[PDB]
A paper describes a structure:
Although several different flaviviruses may cause encephalitis, Japanese encephalitis virus is the most significant, being responsible for thousands of deaths each year in Asia. The entry of flaviviruses into their target cells is mediated by the interaction of E with cell surface receptors. The E proteins form the outer shell and are anchored to the lipid bilayer envelope through their transmembrane helices, together with the M protein. There are 180 copies of each of the E and M proteins per virion with each icosahedral asymmetric unit containing three copies each of E and M.
Here we report the cryo-EM structure of JEV strain P3 in its native form at near-atomic resolution. A final resolution of 4.3 Å (the ‘‘gold’’ standard Fourier shell correlation = 0.143) was achieved. The cryo-EM structure of mature JEV (P3 strain) reveals an icosahedral virion of ~ 510 Å in diameter, slightly bigger than DENV2 and ZIKV (~ 500 Å). Three E-M-M-E heterodimers lying parallel to each other form a raft and 30 such rafts cover the viral surface. The structure reveals unusual “holes” between two monomers within a dimer, formed by cooperative shifts of the k-l hairpin, and i-j, E0-F0 and B0-C0 loops. These holes are surrounded by five encephalitis-specific motifs, which have been proposed to play a key role in the attachment of the encephalitic flaviviruses to their receptor(s). However, JEV (P3 strain) failed to close the “hole” under neutral pH conditions, perhaps because a number of residues highly conserved in the JEV group, including Asp28, Arg44, Lys166, Glu243, Glu244, Glu273, and Lys279 may, together with His264, produce enough electrostatic repulsion to maintain an open conformation at both low and neutral pH. There is a notable hydrogen-bonding network centered on Gln264 near helix αB. It appears that replacement of Gln264 with a Histidine in the attenuated phenotype of JEV could further strengthen this hydrogen-bonding network. Residue Glu138 of the E protein, which is part of motif 3, is one of the points of greatest divergence (in terms of both sequence and structure) between the encephalitic and non-encephalitic viruses and we demonstrate that it plays an essential role in the attachment of the virus to neural cells.
Author numbering:
A (entry chain A), C (entry chain C), D (entry chain E): 1 to 500
B (entry chain B), E (entry chain D), F (entry chain F): 1 to 74
Write the structure that this text describes.
């Protein structure tokens, strides 16, 4: 539930000017906010739990075929009729076979035969739907206080520490405030209606595993389907085959199970966990967060009086920051824990910023350990472990020079722009002018065009660019850029976005 | 069918691994290549016809390399 | 069975050169042949009797509708399913009605309802077919001997007189010789296969009366139809109506009987008599007739010795000939009966020809009556009855001057060309050169073209000519005649052929 | 009688400036008016009841034929005369058959026969007419007060609530004021003369069901018809057939019932309910409505003191608005019920408008439920229920972005233009300048032209446009637009209007 | 239907009186006339359009008198 | 008759479902198609005559596609 170690982790530079700022969070990623005078906050999706489901239609992907019967007729005697047409439990097919005197009839060349057989499902597919009022969101939230290596990832403790909390949000309870205790209370403002279109698509189950799929695509499926409960089906031939009619004797045969093709068919579907309910992995959710009652405890405490120690050695987050662990010998706790981030020992002027502001000794008990993170700047530096001679320090590289970081961010931004659509501008929180219009621009622009010929697959649209390019390649000035914008971008990039 | 008109891919939300991605990226190339590796004679007479018409050079090639995708999967 | 008084009556000028000549006869008309040294023969259709029939398909023109039931569903609950779909004895139709909280459901705007009802036939139509081996032809044949006013039309006598006979012909017995006694025997050679296409169309029965109908047209009837015996039907909706779905309550209603429209529909159909079998009125039949054994009895007898008398007065046939009746006083019978047709009493040279050659006194009994016909020529003449002072005579006009005959001949041919097709050349019996090719010409010419755009109705093709005409009107020389042949003829004439 | 849930529902934006505004209402649709300081009003057609009817003419669609008789005459004896001509209870037809000596007569070729038969109706059709002074209108009217889920659709309660009323209007009582009690009284001004042309057409009954049919079309029915009461008919042959005259014996036969063809014939006819009277479904009626004495009760009451609750969950009207139900715990009733429609919880500023202004707690009884509707704006929002910690709120999407509204507005107008003719401008209530002339323009323009070649059916006029188009396609400048206006519009659109 | 696509007329063999001939000859004129007698305004604007196009004279009339049959029975 | 000159359709006021609408929209196409599907030979020689006269191109087609409706129902 913390932001520690999650593969995808981003920060937010508090612009001040508000106790409120707008956020969008995702299933995997975890978001971390640092703003002055305010502690550091962690928010991440847990999951998406939906409760009650409804069943639109069904499919039988593998079926059984029995009770072959057929009734011949002499030529010129018209269509045959088998009684079994009287029941939907059969599929009847007419037919005809050429006829000699040698067999049964008084004229040559034609005939009529009526083949019927019973039809039944080996095993079937179930679609289901979701009603938005059944949605939930489990969101844990966290703030950085005193932590150890153990308790940190663990939810049991931080409950007692009151530095983290879990909660549910629904369209029924669209926003909540919740108390961290000492630091005050904060306020989430979200929009459950906007998380998904519950009506954009269906829950589908095939055998065990289950899948999210587009509603329009499900209807097309070519296979026996059923009214919602119910009884007996449509188009129920396509699992059967009629052989060559042979005199009176024709056989009909069921195809092999189609189950594989389904699994084959599903690609973009997303695995889900279905028994009574469903748990999504990746959520898409907009929220606003109100920080006023958030404050800083501990400003009372003074410098700590005793030696420090390194339980675990410095290590990298991979996101560009560095955590360490400290244990402390003295008993003076609770006390304020001196540390900074410095260039050379000839200077005490800090440069980087603390991830967690004001490390806080929990208790007076000796040899407690403390888990703390900071973000040193580029190149080389030191970590000053409190002033005074007893000051110990460690020397921790980073190679990250500003341009490389900036370039990486731009690539990340492009990905964010893609697949997050209009909403992607919400990273631009407390918008207006630039940001507000940037969502307005993308609104009709992306809500059309790119999505209008959308439904392309990889090369399908991937190829288009090169074909488009040649138009831009050979064109007229001032016609070029108009065509070129079509050619490059919006297309090739997402084509590169998928690598893989 | 169970074969064609794969829902692949919905591909909304989802920063995660899709049902089968590794297959999907590799699918479209192979089943075409397999067929074209098979009857190359097709491509030969195919490519010629492109150079036949339009005589604007590269746009002729536009037909061919396109046309080579046509015969796979009709 | 005789040719007397039939509204349509034609003669045949014997070309000699054979005892055989080719004929085509018709339902209404009666044919009469005069050829030298040979008596005069009468042949006419009686009827066409077919025996055993088969039943292709059926129709229910008026039906009943009962057992309305419908099952609603809430919106988003998909299609409804009524159990009654489990039986073909119902027609089920889905449906949907908008939905409030006020009625029964927890969302607004839509729904599902499944309407089903039982379906049953008020009264139905039966089609039937004919197998050619079931065909017959009743043909009576007659020769002119001694007759009275009474016996003449009557078949009982002439059997004894042996001057007329009835017989059947089939593809099983395609030709027959049959004895008239004294005059010898004659030979008919026909082609039962060619009378009709038994497979060109069907026998149809609607209620009581029954009809011949192109099997072609007969398929596209829009109405409930049935497999040949059998059970239950297709397209059985079109007699029913669904009202506006109203909440749970919708009604379905049967149309009124369609029976009239059928009668309305049928026009070109021809009335027939159907109980176990059928009797056509108009036949179309080709035959050849072999006269060798036909001879002339009576050449022995001499002139009759006594006064003549007029039982009935001279009268016209309307076909251009004249019959009278004579009674004879003397007892000298059998004796040869002197009569002729003359210009003025100053001449005994006959001019016209006897319809019946050598009137024949039957018996020695006095005051027997004799029925005799002749064909006087144009203008004025006399009828010489007997020779010597006894000779009495009557003066019988005819206005028919030759030219008008030549015309009424032509058009009559022209009519007899139309609707008799290629076969119409059979009047040209003992053909070759002209006549044989004239049937060969018309063969592909009429067997295509006129019949290729055939299916026109009155003005449909009737209008075309005028539209075609304007093309002929404005065209280029040597293109004109090519187009003109299309314009005039082949079209306008049959358009005039139908007057009425 | 309310506007709730009716499939077709429109609103009216009160322009102030009057207590009176002009309306036109329809059978299906329900109209709803919101104007400042004034409650919200509901008016809809109930039905159109006409009282006393008159019978113009009659038809016998299915008849009986019996008592065949015929009297022959010899040729030249002129027309035959059957005595039965002495009675209108028969249809006599002359006729003639060719005649031999063999049958009965002394000359050949012609004759006279007089066929007569009795004529009687199987079952008959009745037309009827309507006299305008027999018209009624049942109109219920409704205002939004305190309601529950149950009582809302129900007329019993709201009578007691005095928030709804039913009434009749006639040309005899063309306008009425009627009291809602507390809110005051209002005034309807209508024009019964204008609802229909009672003389535009007739009421027709065929068997059970009955139909409205243009009296124009209704004359040219080809079938036996009758003077209004009365006795015996005209053109009464067309149900009978004369066979080929055969000697003395000819038969005449009745056609099958034509009843179906009628049902077939009727399409544009509208189902009605006829026993003693008739009830239309779709009315077309102009009215004016005077709101002065309408006021707002409840302005006395203050904020409600206790928790709220959701009996039913929010749901959509499909017309672009949203209703919910609330139950209220406290006993403080009657009290004013705080609610609004908001963007984000960070703002209390309302945006949308209440459908029902000032929700009103009915009584002091706890756990009463209250039914209330509002119209949120586009996108996302919340529903604020109450103030202070008690305040609960729900988050209700809408996707409706303004532009698509602007369109679905237009076409809906366009449809409501078509088939509502000149009167369609009455939506433009309190007109003048634009609106008044817009009805004046359409007046002669539509009252001619489109209605002058009117009587077209689907493709008939539907085809015309394309044919017209080619004229516009190839034409001269400044001639184009003149022709083009004929080509496009006025034609193709109604051709699209009918889809279906 | 029971209405349209009348088998009328087969009209083969048959020198005799057909089921209903007297009706048939009279049918097509009346049901058109009835309609055209009704809305003559149609023919007016109709005839004009014929004279509009093609300017070859009589062939213009070819459109009109033809076109007058079109509107009946669509 | 019971067949032709159907009152269909009055079609005034009436926002509702007409007696039989579903039939009516489908009627006129089928009974013509049924007949034209039948004797296509008609259309062949028909279409030619259109190209014959007027030589203004498309207006020639105006005759044909029109004329194809004529023969149905006379």
């Amino acid at each position: 539930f913390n932001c520690l170690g999650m593969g995808n982790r981003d920060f937010i530079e508090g612009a001040s000017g508000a106790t409120w700022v707008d956020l969008v969070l995702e299933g995997d990623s975890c978001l971390t906010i640092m703003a002055n005078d305010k502690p550091t906050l962690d928010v991440r999706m847990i999951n998406i739990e939906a409760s009650q489901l409804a069943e639109v239609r069904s499919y039988c992907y593998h079926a059984s075929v029995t009770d072959i019967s057929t009734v011949a007729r002499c030529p010129m005697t018209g269509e045959a009729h088998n009684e079994k047409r009287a029941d939907s439990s059969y599929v009847c097919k007419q037919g005809f076979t050429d006829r000699g005197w040698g067999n049964g009839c008084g004229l040559f060349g034609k005939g009529s035969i009526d083949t019927c057989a019973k039809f039944s499902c080996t095993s079937k597919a179930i679609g289901r739907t979701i009603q938005p009022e059944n949605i939930k969101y489990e969101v844990g939230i966290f703030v950085h206080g005193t932590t150890t290596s153990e308790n940190h990832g663990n939810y049991s403790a931080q409950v007692g520490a009151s530095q983290a909390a879990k909660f549910t949000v629904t369209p029924n309870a669209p926003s909540i405030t919740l108390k961290l205790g000492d630091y005050g209370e904060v306020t989430l403002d979200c929009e459950p209606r906007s998380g998904l279109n519950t009506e954009a698509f269906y829950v589908m189950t095939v055998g065990s595993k289950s899948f999210l799929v587009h509603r329009e695509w499900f209807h097309d499926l070519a296979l026996p389907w059923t009214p919602p409960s119910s009884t007996a089906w449509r188009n129920r031939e396509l699992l059967m085959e009629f052989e060559e009619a042979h005199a009176t004797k024709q056989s009909v045969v069921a195809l092999g199970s189609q189950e594989g093709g389904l699994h084959q068919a599903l690609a973009g579907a997303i695995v889900v966990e279905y028994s009574s309910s469903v748990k999504l992995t990746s959520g898409h959710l907009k929220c606003r967060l109100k920080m006023d009652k958030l404050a800083l405890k501990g400003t009372t405490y003074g410098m700590c009086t005793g030696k420090f120690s390194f339980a675990k050695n410095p290590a990298d987050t991979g996101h560009g920051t560095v955590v360490i662990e400290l244990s402390y010998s003295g008993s003076d706790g609770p006390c304020k824990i001196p540390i900074v981030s410095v260039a050379s020992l000839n200077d005490m002027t800090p440069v980087g910023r603390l991830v967690t502001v004001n490390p806080f000794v929990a208790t007076s008990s000796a040899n407690s350990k403390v888990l703390v993170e900071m973000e040193p700047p580029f190149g080389d530096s030191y970590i000053v472990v409190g002033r005074g001679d007893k000051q110990i320090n460690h020397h921790w590289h980073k190679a990250g020079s500003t341009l490389g970081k900036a370039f990486l961010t731009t690539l990340k931004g492009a990905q964010r722009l893609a697949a997050l659509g209009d909403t992607a501008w919400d990273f631009g929180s407390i918008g207006g002018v630039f940001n507000s219009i940037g969502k307005a621009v993308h609104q009709v622009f992306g809500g059309a065009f790119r999505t209008l010929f959308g439904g392309m697959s990889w090369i399908t649209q991937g190829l288009m660019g090169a074909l488009l390019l040649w138009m831009g390649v050979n064109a007229r000035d001032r016609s070029i850029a108009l065509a070129f914008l079509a050619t490059g971008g919006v297309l090739l990039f997402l084509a590169t976005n998928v690598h893989a | 069918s169970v074969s064609v008109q794969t829902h692949g891919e919905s591909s909304l939300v989802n920063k995660t691994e899709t049902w089968l991605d590794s297959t999907k990226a590799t699918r479209y190339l192979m089943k075409t290549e397999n067929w074209i590796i098979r009857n190359p004679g097709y491509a030969f007479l195919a490519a010629v016809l492109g150079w036949m018409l339009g005589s604007n050079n590269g746009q002729r090639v536009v037909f061919t390399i396109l046309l080579l995708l046509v015969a796979p999967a009709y």
